[PDB]
């Protein structure tokens, strides 16, 4: 958290977790599988809760980084960012995207795991940054790195731009900066615009592991509802937009995505290691029609 503003509003931290009882849970995940299948345009919105299984703390859960700071304590990192492994949720999103069942992914996560899982960059908006990505302040070229860039808050990293310029081939030499927003920084223009278009034209927005307290990210899923679509919120704690959910699921997100993939006859791929993909591969064909809840 180094060099960052100490003036931030941290929101509501430490709310207790709720656990849907198993029968209710199984029935809600069947309903989810149906709306995924019936929906043409499906948009996912992910926050810190989809990376807790990998050892990275959230911000506002019972043991979140903000929650611990309010109460005098430091947080507990089990894993480093470099050694963190994509979860079954991350890998399930790769596969959903492969078979046409995911249109776009909006993430508030700076952990680099979507990118490292193999999720195509062109269907991903990292609205708050990525610890592995630095950007040239002069020509806006991004560099995806294998280790974390070392600064946060849109500061200079100490490295310079290596791009050969269209006329004359001379290195740009612009200042490289981290892409990690501080509190009250402006969101990335293009990524926000794309996340907004996707969210406005969706039939179904599904949120996973966000409490939706931060804007404008936290509000993109409402846009969906505004234009006739449905909204599914999956989170252990309550979320700010609970009252607008068509379907709420209080359970572990790995657990929901495992059952959801079972109900749609999809295999969740294993993760070979960090593998950056710039452009979505050609679609695998839509799956064979899934079976029903007896």
């Amino acid at each position: 958290a180094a060099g960052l503003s100490p003036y931030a509003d941290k929101g509501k931290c430490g709310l207790p977790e709720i656990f849907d009882p198993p029968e209710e849970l199984e029935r809600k995940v069947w309903e989810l599988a149906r709306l995924v299948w019936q929906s043409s345009s499906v948009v996912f919105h992910t926050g810190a809760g989809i990376s807790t299984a990998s050892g990275i703390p959230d911000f506002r859960g019972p043991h979140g980084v903000w929650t611990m700071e309010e109460r005098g304590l430091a947080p507990k990192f089990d894993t480093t960012f470099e050694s963190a492994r994509p979860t079954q949720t991350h890998m399930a999103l790769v596969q959903l995207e492969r078979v046409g069942l995911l249109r776009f992914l909006v993430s508030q996560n700076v952990d680099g795991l979507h990118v490292r899982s193999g999720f195509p960059r062109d269907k991903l908006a990292e609205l708050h940054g990525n610890m592995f990505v630095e950007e040239c302040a002069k020509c806006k070229t991004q560099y995806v790195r294998d280790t974390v860039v070392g600064t946060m808050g849109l500061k200079a990293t100490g490295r310079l731009c290596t791009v050969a310029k269209a006329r004359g081939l001379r290195a740009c030499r612009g200042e490289l900066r981290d892409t990690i927003l501080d509190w009250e920084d402006s969101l990335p223009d293009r990524d926000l615009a794309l996340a907004d278009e996707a969210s406005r034209n969706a039939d179904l927005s599904i949120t996973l592991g966000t409490s939706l307290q931060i804007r404008p990210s936290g509000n993109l899923p409402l846009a969906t509802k505004r234009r006739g679509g449905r909204l599914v919120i999956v989170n252990l704690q309550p979320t700010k937009h609970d009252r607008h959910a068509d379907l709420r699921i209080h359970g572990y997100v790995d657990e929901v995505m495992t059952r959801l993939m079972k109900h749609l006859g999809l295999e969740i791929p294993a993760w070979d290691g960090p593998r950056v993909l710039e452009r979505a591969l050609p679609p695998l064909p839509r799956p064979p029609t899934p079976k029903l809840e007896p």
């Binding site: 509003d9 929101g11 708050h128 009250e184 402006s186 969101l187 931060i214």
Partner: peptide, 7 residues
């Protein structure tokens, strides 16, 4: 130029 905040 939308900004990362609570409200």
């Amino acid at each position: 130029t939308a900004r990362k905040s609570t409200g």
